[PDB]
Design an enzyme around this catalytic site. Sequence first.
Site, PDB file in Angstrom:
ATOM      1  N   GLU A   1      35.037 -96.141 -62.716  1.00  0.00           N
ATOM      2  CA  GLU A   1      34.655 -95.037 -62.538  1.00  0.00           C
ATOM      3  C   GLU A   1      35.801 -93.644 -62.716  1.00  0.00           C
ATOM      4  O   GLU A   1      35.708 -92.334 -63.534  1.00  0.00           O
ATOM      5  CB  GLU A   1      33.984 -93.895 -61.623  1.00  0.00           C
ATOM      6  CG  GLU A   1      34.546 -93.808 -60.691  1.00  0.00           C
ATOM      7  CD  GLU A   1      35.158 -95.162 -59.525  1.00  0.00           C
ATOM      8  OE1 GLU A   1      34.583 -94.915 -58.330  1.00  0.00           O
ATOM      9  OE2 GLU A   1      34.739 -95.745 -59.916  1.00  0.00           O
TER      10      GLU A   1
ATOM     11  N   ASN B   1      39.404 -98.638 -63.375  1.00  0.00           N
ATOM     12  CA  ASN B   1      39.463 -99.203 -62.172  1.00  0.00           C
ATOM     13  C   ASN B   1      38.588-100.360 -61.910  1.00  0.00           C
ATOM     14  O   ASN B   1      38.033-100.701 -63.011  1.00  0.00           O
ATOM     15  CB  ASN B   1      39.033 -97.866 -61.121  1.00  0.00           C
ATOM     16  CG  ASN B   1      37.908 -97.390 -60.848  1.00  0.00           C
ATOM     17  OD1 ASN B   1      37.590 -96.853 -61.670  1.00  0.00           O
ATOM     18  ND2 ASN B   1      37.507 -97.424 -59.061  1.00  0.00           N
TER      19      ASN B   1
ATOM     20  N   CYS C   1      35.544 -99.685 -60.223  1.00  0.00           N
ATOM     21  CA  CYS C   1      33.812-100.009 -60.453  1.00  0.00           C
ATOM     22  C   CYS C   1      33.966 -99.012 -61.638  1.00  0.00           C
ATOM     23  O   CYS C   1      33.029 -98.175 -61.701  1.00  0.00           O
ATOM     24  CB  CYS C   1      34.187 -99.057 -59.285  1.00  0.00           C
ATOM     25  SG  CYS C   1      33.385-100.078 -58.043  1.00  0.00           S
TER      26      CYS C   1
HETATM   27  N1  LIG Z   1      35.045-102.489 -47.470  1.00  0.00           N
HETATM   28  C1  LIG Z   1      34.930-101.327 -48.860  1.00  0.00           C
HETATM   29  C2  LIG Z   1      34.857-100.729 -49.278  1.00  0.00           C
HETATM   30  C3  LIG Z   1      34.725-100.618 -50.632  1.00  0.00           C
HETATM   31  N2  LIG Z   1      36.153 -99.850 -51.262  1.00  0.00           N
HETATM   32  C4  LIG Z   1      36.527 -98.840 -52.394  1.00  0.00           C
HETATM   33  O1  LIG Z   1      35.521 -98.232 -53.301  1.00  0.00           O
HETATM   34  C5  LIG Z   1      34.941 -99.346 -54.054  1.00  0.00           C
HETATM   35  C6  LIG Z   1      33.912 -99.206 -53.757  1.00  0.00           C
HETATM   36  O2  LIG Z   1      32.959 -97.827 -54.086  1.00  0.00           O
HETATM   37  P1  LIG Z   1      31.515 -97.376 -53.190  1.00  0.00           P
HETATM   38  O3  LIG Z   1      31.955 -96.297 -53.623  1.00  0.00           O
HETATM   39  O4  LIG Z   1      30.625 -98.009 -54.012  1.00  0.00           O
HETATM   40  O5  LIG Z   1      31.840 -98.124 -51.626  1.00  0.00           O
HETATM   41  P2  LIG Z   1      31.540 -96.882 -50.657  1.00  0.00           P
HETATM   42  O6  LIG Z   1      32.940 -95.586 -50.891  1.00  0.00           O
HETATM   43  O7  LIG Z   1      30.026 -96.317 -50.609  1.00  0.00           O
HETATM   44  O8  LIG Z   1      32.021 -97.917 -49.379  1.00  0.00           O
HETATM   45  C7  LIG Z   1      35.480-100.969 -53.493  1.00  0.00           C
HETATM   46  O9  LIG Z   1      35.700-100.678 -55.499  1.00  0.00           O
HETATM   47  C8  LIG Z   1      36.840 -99.919 -53.659  1.00  0.00           C
HETATM   48  O10 LIG Z   1      37.730 -99.676 -54.084  1.00  0.00           O
HETATM   49  C9  LIG Z   1      37.151-101.128 -50.385  1.00  0.00           C
HETATM   50  O11 LIG Z   1      38.531-100.330 -49.867  1.00  0.00           O
HETATM   51  N3  LIG Z   1      36.614-101.100 -48.358  1.00  0.00           N
END
Ligand SMILES: Nc1ccn([C@@H]2O[C@H](COP(=O)(O)OP(=O)(O)O)[C@@H](O)[C@H]2O)c(=O)n1
EC number: 1.17.4.1
Lengths: 666, 666
Positions: free
Chosen positions: A357, A353, A355
């Site tokens: 993971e 994906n 990120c």
């Molecule tokens: N404002 C946001 C931030 C992250 N995301 C999603 O979650 C991913 C980022 O993962 P993360 O775990 O670092 O972000 P958070 O869940 O802490 O906001 C991004 O690649 C998107 O897939 C989103 O849809 N909208």
Amino acid sequence: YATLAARIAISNLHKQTTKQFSKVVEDLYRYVNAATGKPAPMISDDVYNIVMENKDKLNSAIVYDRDFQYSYFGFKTLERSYLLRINGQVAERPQHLIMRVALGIHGRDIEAALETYNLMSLKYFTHASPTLFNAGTPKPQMSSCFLVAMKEDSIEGIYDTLKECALISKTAGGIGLHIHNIRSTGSYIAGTNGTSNGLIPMIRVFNNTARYVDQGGNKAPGAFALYLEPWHADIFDFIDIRKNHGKEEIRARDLFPALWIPDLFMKRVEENGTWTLFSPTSAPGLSDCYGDEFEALYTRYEKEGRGKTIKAQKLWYSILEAQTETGTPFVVYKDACNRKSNQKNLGVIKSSNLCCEIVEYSAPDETAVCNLASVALPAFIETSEDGKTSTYNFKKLHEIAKVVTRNLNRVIDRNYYPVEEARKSNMRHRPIALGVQGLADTFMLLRLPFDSEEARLLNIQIFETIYHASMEASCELAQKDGPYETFQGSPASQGILQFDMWDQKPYGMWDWDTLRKDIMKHGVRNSLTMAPMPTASTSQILGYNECFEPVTSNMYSFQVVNPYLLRDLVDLGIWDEGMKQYLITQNGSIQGLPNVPQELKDLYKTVWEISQKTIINMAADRSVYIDQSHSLNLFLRAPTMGKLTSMHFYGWKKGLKTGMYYLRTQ
Amino acid sequence: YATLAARIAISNLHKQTTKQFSKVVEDLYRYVNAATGKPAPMISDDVYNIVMENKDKLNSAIVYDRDFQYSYFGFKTLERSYLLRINGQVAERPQHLIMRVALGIHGRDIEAALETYNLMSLKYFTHASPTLFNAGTPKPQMSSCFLVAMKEDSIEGIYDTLKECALISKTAGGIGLHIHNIRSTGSYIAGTNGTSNGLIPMIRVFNNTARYVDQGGNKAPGAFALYLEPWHADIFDFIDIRKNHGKEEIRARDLFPALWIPDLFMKRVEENGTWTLFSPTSAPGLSDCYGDEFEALYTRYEKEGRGKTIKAQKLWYSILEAQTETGTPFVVYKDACNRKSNQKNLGVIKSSNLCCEIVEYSAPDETAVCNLASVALPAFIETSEDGKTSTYNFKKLHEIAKVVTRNLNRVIDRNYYPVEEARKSNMRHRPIALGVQGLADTFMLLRLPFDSEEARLLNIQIFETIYHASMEASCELAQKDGPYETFQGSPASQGILQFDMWDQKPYGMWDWDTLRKDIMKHGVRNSLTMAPMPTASTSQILGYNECFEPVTSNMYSFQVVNPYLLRDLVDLGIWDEGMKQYLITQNGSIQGLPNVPQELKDLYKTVWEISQKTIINMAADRSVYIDQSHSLNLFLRAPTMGKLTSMHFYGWKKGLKTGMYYLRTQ
Ligand SMILES: Nc1ccn([C@@H]2O[C@H](COP(=O)(O)OP(=O)(O)O)[C@@H](O)[C@H]2O)c(=O)n1
Ligand SMILES: Nc1ncnc2c1ncn2[C@@H]1O[C@H](COP(=O)(O)OP(=O)(O)NP(=O)(O)O)[C@@H](O)[C@H]1O
Ligand SMILES: Nc1ncnc2c1ncn2[C@@H]1O[C@H](COP(=O)(O)OP(=O)(O)NP(=O)(O)O)[C@@H](O)[C@H]1O
Ligand SMILES: Nc1ccn([C@@H]2O[C@H](COP(=O)(O)OP(=O)(O)O)[C@@H](O)[C@H]2O)c(=O)n1
Ligand SMILES: [Mg+2]
Ligand SMILES: [Mg+2]
């Protein structure tokens, strides 16, 4: 220090907001867009009726004191993008957001609702942003990532795929899109003297749709990750897609290249040998197998003149170039991902994906989805012996990880799916992703340098417990609702858990034999449970360091100094202005500071001071309790072709799935 | 002069090519792509079997002398893009291409085949390029233009539409795409605080797909025309889309803006009044009506505060700006097109095509298509009285126009349709488009200045005959195969022909009453027959001036001087080097040349010397015998806001459909 600006802006917020929760749900639900006259509700019918049928139980459950658990930057994050707004002004208090999220997940199980609320309000765990945005709202798209298959090597396939990314990008979530099956520059096309343009020009179309489908607020990232296997004949350009110079018709700056690497590639680089590039049309089937079957089929095509040979290290060198300048392509090992997936009964996994993971199966008609939550590692520290030393409460961590697992599992059923490929897919295999945040804090609070023997152990320990917990919770679920559709034939059905596929005995803190017995007997509800994610935003909401990485500086950033450091420097009466300045001037680095104890210099190494071998080691240690994968950022001090080379190979030989996410530098 | 380079390169071609046609069809059919090993036939199974079952009749029918009817530039055009190539080398002789085209149309009616062959080989008429490219080939997409409806105001609608243009652009043909129904910048979108971006960013996506779907050879144009009604709130940017300066995120240089103008707009400009801009979402139904119904509905919305009012002439001035700099937007009158279409029984027409000549009905599920051919006007000149004066043979022109009509009508059934919307559509209404080329020549050869009374008459005369012919042929077809599906309810079903809708008596060269009787009795096979197109390429193949415009210069262009001019200057013994130079130095203008007869200066005015009122007049005269529309280029000497203004209004008041195609300048 200025933690005092937190309280101010918090109770300012109390003043501009209706205290009673059920009134706020009324407000949000009743909302009409003044400019347009349109009834624009922000709560679902379903969650509205629930709140109304339970308003006293609910309003009285809410503890507003728990609003002051947020640092200033935590709170400003909440304010600026999370708390629901009525006509420009913020309408939700933090407690309301949480309570809404609890309901959106739990529906009529008010007992489950109250348990989640309590645990979240107290900062035990948090769900990913899309869940925080949309649970309890009329289009509740709560998933963080979609893994999309390129439907076909045709204009129709390409434009069906483009449509799907577009429909997905309207809402929250990131996209990983694999393209190994698109023919490369110059390939034949039947019915013209026209040749194919290949990947780059087709990428430019995708990049352009990324830019156009904004307007979902700022909840879409506006970026896709694209996955390619390094044998594809378009590889050199593909990896240079975020390059900051050169021609513009060759770049695609709003997308991320991610490599899907077969082991063969790496052997060839190490052996200093030949690598052969094919177009998918002159080499069919190549992305649809792995390990030995691939090795055999690749070698044959390579012997049968079907492609173009050059030196492995020519490609290798270009990759390191691209990575040094741009931090990409990411590196994920195809074979490690497929050899060690509980989803191998479904067929070959063709990407991760956005990120790096999620490691799930995707196909033209199934677009894999995942719902994420993270545990607050530091919340399970207590002093609990009797005296001064702090221990770690693993019982509570097992207990809490079982709760999150149940939450994530409900979110699957109450999720809004942007495309039918995602609903088909997620309903069959029901994958789930749990993560962590605040690993660095936990260590710091527990007086452990990141590179100590004690830290190495606790790393293993924590992850053993989350994985055990989640499989236990999931197995209880299988007992109430059946296993997930495709559980027969899975490694978990044959008694094979994640560490077994790494050929390791579990650290043995929990009874795996009992668990394994019950799984063969009853199944699991979820094909996959664990995939530690970046937590970039949500760890800022809980005030912790992202993820499982060490601090980047001790100067967090008005600039606020690491509270644990501060704590310790003041208690040693050596915190003055010389201190404030030495650390600014070194950007949160405390080594080479004349008057600071060695115990603290070990404890507060910054990720640039910690050796990457240690970093990779811990990633390897924990990885045997990770169903899926994790977002390994790498950090390099004074970067060189050789240092980077030994890092990929080191992780590659460790059996890692995600060898590298971003490469971060200076 | 160097017409001698024609013969050379012609019989050079004879040397590099197999004389016998049936051997060439064997060659082309049997072709295998050496680089790839793939059997890549260039004749259909169907046309192959035909040729093989008829090889002596066919080979012996071919007159190779008729290869020397081509000027040098005609032939180089044929060579470079038309004659089928075997592995880089040209395999088809001109006669083979023609013979193939004859078969691809006629199938087993070898008598029809031989008649078309003869007539084409002799240069009586020619079909449009897509037919010349693809008749007799395995994906025979023979149509020149598709009129595509924007499917819906949604990401899904938009991306379904994008898919369809992409699938169409793989092959020959231009696209006209109407977008009046997409909400403008800043409109509400339900389910976000996000606003809409409007047209421009969505245009940039279309432009990008235009650039990416090349590789159909160079048979696609790689440009779309887009149609908008000037009340749309995104209008100012939309018209500036080909501007050569300003911001890049606002332009879309590979597309053409075309205006779909309601009469209301023009009245308001003339009255110096208000114009109101709406988003389609605050003003539904606006593009789905015309004339009075529109006027009523527009005025109401304009009174109900639903949009934004500014000065009509602000818009008007911007349009003239855009047109002066770029030659666009094109101008087509919506009401004139709908008031006077034999397709009005189907519902409101929402656009024209890429050359502003097709006026057909399109809808999300029907994408209108058309097949074009042009008549060689000069081929019907003979001396036939007895002595010196030349007359015009209208009998033969009626005879030949009936042949073309029958050809075009077969092409409908033997056409490959890129999308199901085009097959659904074309099979129901069976439109057809006939054109002309070499009008300027015809006049020149017949000693008539373009702006004479005699030219005005012959203009009317010719067009009366083509229209009469085509309706006659079409009506005979209706007698053998029935009327087209949607003929009941049509104006033609009610006895109303094209000139009647212009409220005019026909010039009366042919018996319309007999024809009209038979049409009400039997129907027609084609909803529409006539739409004079630019003939940019095919008139170069036949060596004539495009279309129905006057010469642009008398210096055609190595540079070759107008043969009729040359002829005449030499016969007056005044052709020397002073002549070669005066004309180069004035770019094919002969006025203000000291020693040249006035008779010749009238005869050889260049389009810049001819007045536009005369030009518009003849377009108005002929238009009453034009089912559909025609590509009126305008030419302006020393261009000014006022001169351009009086030209639009002049054509607008003449009742024209296409008021302007390109505006050409200096
Ligand atoms: N404002 C946001 C931030 C992250 N995301 C999603 O979650 C991913 C980022 O993962 P993360 O775990 O670092 O972000 P958070 O869940 O802490 O906001 C991004 O690649 C998107 O897939 C989103 O849809 N909208
Ligand atoms: N007109 C075009 N312009 C650019 N690329 C094209 C075009 N047509 C095909 N391609 C590329 O070639 C591949 C095949 O396209 P497709 O739509 O399958 O055409 P096709 O007629 O089926 N030719 P083939 O696949 O060789 O049988 C796709 O990956 C396209 O990206
Ligand atoms: N995420 C987005 N980014 C950019 N434009 C969008 C987005 N979503 C919608 N639009 C534009 O808004 C219009 C409506 O899009 P659509 O796919 O119908 O969304 P919807 O959820 O149905 N909203 P609505 O049409 O207001 O009910 C289309 O013209 C889109 O171009
Ligand atoms: N090479 C070409 C040239 C024109 N065309 C189509 O026909 C239109 C040009 O019309 P035209 O009558 O001026 O061109 P010809 O038929 O003389 O080549 C273009 O807009 C396309 O719709 C095409 O498909 N491929
Ligand atoms: Mg195909
Ligand atoms: Mg919609």
